[PDB]
Amino acid sequence: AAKDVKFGNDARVKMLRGVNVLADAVKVTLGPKGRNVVLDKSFGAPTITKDGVSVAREIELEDKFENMGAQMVKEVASKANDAAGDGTTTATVLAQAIITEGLKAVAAGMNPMDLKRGIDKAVTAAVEELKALSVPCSDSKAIAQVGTISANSDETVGKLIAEAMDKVGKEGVITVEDGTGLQDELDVVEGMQFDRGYLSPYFINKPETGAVELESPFILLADKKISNIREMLPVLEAVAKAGKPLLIIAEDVEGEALATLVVNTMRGIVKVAAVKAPGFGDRRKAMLQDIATLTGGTVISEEIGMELEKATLEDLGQAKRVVINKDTTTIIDGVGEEAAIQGRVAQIRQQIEEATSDYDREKLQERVAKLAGGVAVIKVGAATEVEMKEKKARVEDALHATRAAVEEGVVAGGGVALIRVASKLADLRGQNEDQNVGIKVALRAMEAPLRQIVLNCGEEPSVVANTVKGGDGNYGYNAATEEYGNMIDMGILDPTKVTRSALQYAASVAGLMITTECMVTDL
Amino acid sequence: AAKDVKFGNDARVKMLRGVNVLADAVKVTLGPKGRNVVLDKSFGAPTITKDGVSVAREIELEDKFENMGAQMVKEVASKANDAAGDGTTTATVLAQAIITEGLKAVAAGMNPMDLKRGIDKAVTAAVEELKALSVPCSDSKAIAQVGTISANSDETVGKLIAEAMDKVGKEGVITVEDGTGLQDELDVVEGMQFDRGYLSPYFINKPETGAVELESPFILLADKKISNIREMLPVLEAVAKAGKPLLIIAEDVEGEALATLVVNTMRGIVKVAAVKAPGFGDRRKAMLQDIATLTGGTVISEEIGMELEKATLEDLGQAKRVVINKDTTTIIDGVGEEAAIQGRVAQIRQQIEEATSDYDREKLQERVAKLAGGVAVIKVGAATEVEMKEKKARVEDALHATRAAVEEGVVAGGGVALIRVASKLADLRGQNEDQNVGIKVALRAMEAPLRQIVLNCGEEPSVVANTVKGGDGNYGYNAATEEYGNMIDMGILDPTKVTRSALQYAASVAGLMITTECMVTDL
Amino acid sequence: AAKDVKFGNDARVKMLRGVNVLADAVKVTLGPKGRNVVLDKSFGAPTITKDGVSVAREIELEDKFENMGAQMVKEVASKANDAAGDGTTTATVLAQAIITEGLKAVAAGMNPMDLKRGIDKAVTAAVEELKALSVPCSDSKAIAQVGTISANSDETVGKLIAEAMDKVGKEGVITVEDGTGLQDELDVVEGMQFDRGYLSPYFINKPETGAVELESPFILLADKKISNIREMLPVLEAVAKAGKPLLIIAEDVEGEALATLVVNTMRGIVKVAAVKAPGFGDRRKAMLQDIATLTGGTVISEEIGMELEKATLEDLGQAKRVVINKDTTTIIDGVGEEAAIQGRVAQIRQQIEEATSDYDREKLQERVAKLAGGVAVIKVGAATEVEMKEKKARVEDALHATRAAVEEGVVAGGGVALIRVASKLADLRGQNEDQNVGIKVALRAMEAPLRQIVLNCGEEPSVVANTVKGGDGNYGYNAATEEYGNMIDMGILDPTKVTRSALQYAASVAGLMITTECMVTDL
Ligand SMILES: Nc1ncnc2c1ncn2[C@@H]1O[C@H](COP(=O)(O)OP(=O)(O)OP(=O)(O)O)[C@@H](O)[C@H]1O
Ligand SMILES: Nc1ncnc2c1ncn2[C@@H]1O[C@H](COP(=O)(O)OP(=O)(O)OP(=O)(O)O)[C@@H](O)[C@H]1O
Ligand SMILES: Nc1ncnc2c1ncn2[C@@H]1O[C@H](COP(=O)(O)OP(=O)(O)OP(=O)(O)O)[C@@H](O)[C@H]1O
Ligand SMILES: [K+]
Ligand SMILES: [K+]
Ligand SMILES: [K+]
Ligand SMILES: [Mg+2]
Ligand SMILES: [Mg+2]
Ligand SMILES: [Mg+2]
DSSP states (O other): OOEEEEEHHHHHHHHHHHHHHHHHHHHTTOSTTOOOEEEOOSSSSOEEEOOHHHHHHHOOOSSHHHHHHHHHHHHHHHHHHHHTSSOHHHHHHHHHHHHHHHHHHHHTTOOHHHHHHHHHHHHHHHHHHHHHHOBOHHHHOOHHHHHHHHTTSOHHHHHHHHHHHHHHOTTSEEEEEEOSSSSOEEEEEOOEEESOOBSOGGGOOSSTTSSEEEESOEEEEESSOOOOSTTTHHHHHHHTTTSSOEEEEOSOOOSTTTHHHHHHHOOSSSOEEEEOOSSSTHHHHHHHHHHHHHHTOOEEOTTTOOOGGGOOTTTSEEBSEEEEOSSOEEEOOBOSOHHHHHHHHHHHHHHHHHOOOHHHHHHHHHHHHHHHHOEEEEEEOOSSHHHHHHHHHHHHHHHHHHHHHHHHOEEETTTHHHHHHHHHTTTOOOSSHHHHHHHHHHHHHTTHHHHHHHHHTTSOHHHHHHHHHHSOTTEEEETTTTEEEETTTTTOEEEHHHHHHHHHHHHHHHHHHTTEEEEEEEO | OOEEEEEHHHHHHHHHHHHHHHHHHHHTTOSTTOOEEEEOOSSSSOEEEOOHHHHHHHOOOSSHHHHHHHHHHHHHHHHHHHHHSSOHHHHHHHHHHHHHHHHHHHHTTOOHHHHHHHHHHHHHHHHHHHHHHOBOHHHHOOHHHHHHHHTTSOHHHHHHHHHHHHHHOTTSEEEEEEOSSSSOEEEEEOOEEESOOBSOGGGOOSSTTSSEEEESOEEEEESSOOOOSTTTHHHHHHHTTTSSOEEEEOSOOOSTTTHHHHHHHOOSSSOEEEEOOSSSTHHHHHHHHHHHHHHTOOEEOTTTOOOGGGOOTTTSEEBSEEEEOSSOEEEOOBOSOHHHHHHHHHHHHHHHHHOOOHHHHHHHHHHHHHHHHOEEEEEEOOSSHHHHHHHHHHHHHHHHHHHHHHHHOEEETTTHHHHHHHHHTTTOOOSSHHHHHHHHHHHHHTTHHHHHHHHHTTSOHHHHHHHHHHSOTTEEEETTTTEEEETTTTTOEEEHHHHHHHHHHHHHHHHHHTTOOEEEEEO | OOEEEEEHHHHHHHHHHHHHHHHHHHHTTOSTTOOOEEEOOSSSSOEEEOOHHHHHHHOOOSSHHHHHHHHHHHHHHHHHHHHTSSOHHHHHHHHHHHHHHHHHHHHTTOOHHHHHHHHHHHHHHHHHHHHHHOBOHHHHOOHHHHHHHHTTSOHHHHHHHHHHHHHHOTTSEEEEEEOSSSSOEEEEEOOEEESOOBSOGGGOOSSTTSSEEEESOEEEEESSOOOOSTTTHHHHHHHTTTSSOEEEEOSOOOSTTTHHHHHHHOOSSSOEEEEOOSSSTHHHHHHHHHHHHHHTOOEEOTTTOOOGGGOOTTTSEEBSEEEEOSSOEEEOOBOSOHHHHHHHHHHHHHHHHHOOOHHHHHHHHHHHHHHHHOEEEEEEOOSSHHHHHHHHHHHHHHHHHHHHHHHHOEEETTTHHHHHHHHHTTTOOOSSHHHHHHHHHHHHHTTHHHHHHHHHTTSOHHHHHHHHHHSOTTEEEETTTTEEEETTTTTOEEEHHHHHHHHHHHHHHHHHHTTOOEEEEEO
């Protein structure tokens, strides 16, 4: 359609206004004194959330240029959520700070591409300094504290995550789901988890989580690829009067002969899903055999000759819950048979004792780790649904932060790590003066998380930023108690991955946006 | 419908206003100090782009006559992008300059057709002078510099293109695709590339690139043309539950019995495509055999008697990525078997040693060059999707510019080549005075790229244009450093094809538009 | 009333938009290639004028903040017109340039008060350098050239002013008035001129010149101050049926018993005016006696005892034209008696021969200079009234410029003097960096007159500014012939007072306006 085309300062101030609307809505949530945001839903009751990416996602502005700025910055929170599952508000605050100071530099006549290059150089150096400053999770041993900080100082949530990682291992799979009582429960049940996703984007359920849950599902397993429709239409009908939702695990799944016909079939009462299987050839066969033994099901094959038309519903596997996500699909509780599960575990232990090839040994030890660790499940306890969603979001943040902590390490929380790396980057210089100003813009913007935290405390951000900068090491500002101390000692720990990801995604988007001279949108 | 009809100066100033809106939006992006343009998308987040043709494509105006002018000039950027893949902003700047000065001449009462003839004569002479001024890429040997200049002074991108051309040859196929890390990666993998396009315009995917990508596709090969639908409906169903997207390579593909039925089948989850095969008869058979051996597939034939109904999914070829474009379709990574690939390479080397016919020898050496060079793939590394699109556009510009440089040569960058050829054309005369004024309009307009570059530097375009004109040879103005020097020495190189194409397409459209006395549009 | 209150950038861009509207309307008139502006009048036919202050005065904008900016800049042209009578367009161009560059510096975050201080320091230094660069009019001897340049290269006007100054002296009084023929006539007639103004602001005639003209007036002279109304009401009635307009010359004139009653008397057919007399005591008596002898009138006094009630209309003085202005009031042609005038001249020559006191000698020699020089009158010849107003404005500009040239000297025209003094001020520094930037803003803005002249020539301002800067001395750019040369040799001379006044008034207003953070206006 016809386009509104804005240039220079007018376009930049409109885009910055959109950035500011999104970032203010997100930044009210930052820190232990951060507040909640109510997002209206046409689907049902409004959602009360502290999660920054949720607020960012809901933001859309009437002014098209302001909306453009808001959408580009919303990408920061989305990328931070996708990569680390936490720090989306920190990422938004950093992005807004970089954009604000970089646009001020642009208004000062400095070359915006050189400002972006300086920002990028400063952020690369700051990521290196964050890696250097990071303390490995083995050394720190504060999973409870990391989860507590990520759960908005909910010590119960952090303790639950710590117990789950003590039971299923620091690499074991933990899944958050809605409970029934008022208290958060933890249960380690036998389940499975593989790094695959759904093959159809229309499988999304009513909740907007992007991960689809099925209660008491039926499991179908196949390694050979079926061709004709009429040889599993009876099997499809059998599962279509079994009563339990169908989850198929295969090598790969198409949509033009399976997904389209079935979506033309139902209207959305009960869901049927199909996903890939990890590995290929013998590894995929072993994976499907393990899943079938876990769920009590069977795997069809060409060599066996066991056809689908002879399969019954008792032959197929049965589970209690499955959560399918693009990144990773988990089967929460497959009943099967406990004796059969133990026998398979013993058989694969004999496989440990027999195998000698390095790749075979490592994949088989991955199999035994997945079997022995099991699946930890956290039942979120809340009196109401709005409290359920808020608490589940906080527990999911805690899980993501603890995973990031065991993956990449921890740094001082409360924006202190960014302050320290900014102080360590004070001598960083670019190729010209505009690159130096971009570096300074990035360094000042890495003070923004701490300053926003202090603002959310009702305190003076410049005084606290000055006091933290004047300190050294993990000295920082407890925002829960409004006093200074060693951030590690008071347990205010951030995952290094979370801080680094927030900085990187904020920098990429914000450095791109400060380089914009014209914006084109609809009238 | 009813038509608004405008004449003479009113029509011309409206059309020029539309030209100016489009050209200003595009020209803010010109040069190393050029800035980015944010294009709003209804599909998702706005795209930040320096690419001039992207900005030009997004431009559409409310005023119908201004929109008419904008659309005709948008044709300049589109043609420059189609022909050279670079210089679209230079082409737009040249077109706007020719239009502005030619409309000034028209207002001076000079015959617009004679002005157009003078512009055309000057541009033909300037293309000849650009060919004379061009330095062959073998002599210059600055592929890294050409790619760096085209990538907006991104030395990493230019070095990556230079390494890719050092690995797969200056004629080898290089494909840009989205990476996963933050860094640009280069990998030379075994693949295929042929000069064919899709037979259906509705195969366009969600991205507006015009080239469609498929991840881990299945490969179907056929030289004989099948007739009845029921003899590959089972095979179609097999691929429709194989899980991988289908890509058919045949002699030629229709749409009234294949495309319409399948588009009535799916709603757009997984795509199935079919394309032509290069050559005919024995050459097409050799091409399909080579592709099948690369992907591990098989080729059906009448002499063999191997029917499609007996084909299995293991018999069909499997790849990792394919990119289908109207100009050229590439298979990025076909796994097949490495030993089989090497054996086929040895067999075709024996074919080199055996064949003696000149056409057969040259086509067989083309086959061995395509097999030995392989496919270079550049993984664009970016933290975010908007940065991914911007960086991928810059790398695609660099690839197009390096291809144009090895095809047609290089000239001094920064608009210097056009300045030099304009100086060499100072004595060019037409058949009358209006043709001479058209020649002068073209010659002055070829200063416009340098002048716009200087304007984007915040500097004085007339002073720098005067200084560059007063110099000789590759003397010009480094806009990155705002100082004069030998453009070849500082590595500011433009592909001669890019400069020539920009000038020619700008001239054709602009010379046509300055001849317009009436415009007819909707009310 | 309720106030719209704007802050920061919004207020500044609105004010700059108003500045730009006024300055563009004025600047189209600058230089020999400058064009005319038509100002609509509700009174009658529109006025075509090249005069910059006329255009500036007519400018008023709908947007209140833009109007505010326009009004403050209009003060520049008004002050330049009041002080020098020329250079109002140069003053406006300088003011717009200072405002534009200073607002750019303000947007760059620099302290606007320090920018204003730097501008003021640069302008003080530039005024000193203009005084140093100035060539006295005695040395240059180019009154014809100064008048020609001020009359928009009208050599006839400059020659007329040169002849008038050759006849009545370089200090003699010259008055421009409408002629009757098509040619500009010059006549030196016996008249008087004193530095006084009207005592009532409601005496303004229908033309908006601010100086009121009376044709064939009657002259009344008085040194003693009358008290009762009834003792000159008969005399007032006598002049009220004499037929000629009344002009009273007294010590001082009130309004509450003279002006209010008479303005309640007439409706505006024939005007009666009263003005002060120069000097005091004996000097005022000598002045009134000289004026009475020039006009054939008589002066009342207490010592003489000659009362007003006995005065007749033949006793009162009679003239042909008088022009009354606040700065200076002139009697153009008082008939009186030529023999009486010569006898009075001889008597005052005897007074020269008799007087010895220095103050008495100098005032008496001022008297004899005023009597001997007489009054030069330039009859503007034009076919039409619009041409009459345009030509009269140009001749008035020429008169003001020649007066300024004989007062303060001449410098190279065409903005060259400002370029030279800016070059001589390249090492000027302030107390801080913002003051240095203000100095640079002023120095760059003194290039603006030449650059605007070049723009009005259709040429490239940066190239010509560079060429003029690269020269030295009076080297500059003839804009009439579009070529370089010695500005003094080609007769392009500006009065030093005009250039200095333009710079000073532009600097004062513009430096004040760049310091503005908030604007308050009506809604
Ligand atoms: N008691 C505390 N004192 C100081 N800083 C704290 C404290 N508790 C948390 N923080 C800091 O608050 C930040 C995390 O805040 P929050 O979890 O509200 O937002 P986020 O992680 O940026 O984003 P989101 O959770 O929405 O993805 C971290 O920098 C953390 O160190
Ligand atoms: N450092 C530099 N100094 C001078 N000129 C430069 C420099 N870097 C690039 N240029 C010039 O800028 C022009 C290319 O600019 P840019 O890539 O932004 O636009 P384009 O090639 O016209 O169009 P597009 O890339 O949008 O298709 C060329 O003329 C090139 O020589
Ligand atoms: N032939 C010429 N070549 C170069 N400069 C010239 C020439 N004639 C006049 N100028 C310059 O033009 C300027 C005067 O222009 P103009 O009289 O139109 O405007 P102004 O004096 O600024 O204002 P205004 O007359 O409206 O009060 C001076 O700087 C003068 O030197
Ligand atoms: K939060
Ligand atoms: K560009
Ligand atoms: K003027
Ligand atoms: Mg958090
Ligand atoms: Mg380019
Ligand atoms: Mg003048």
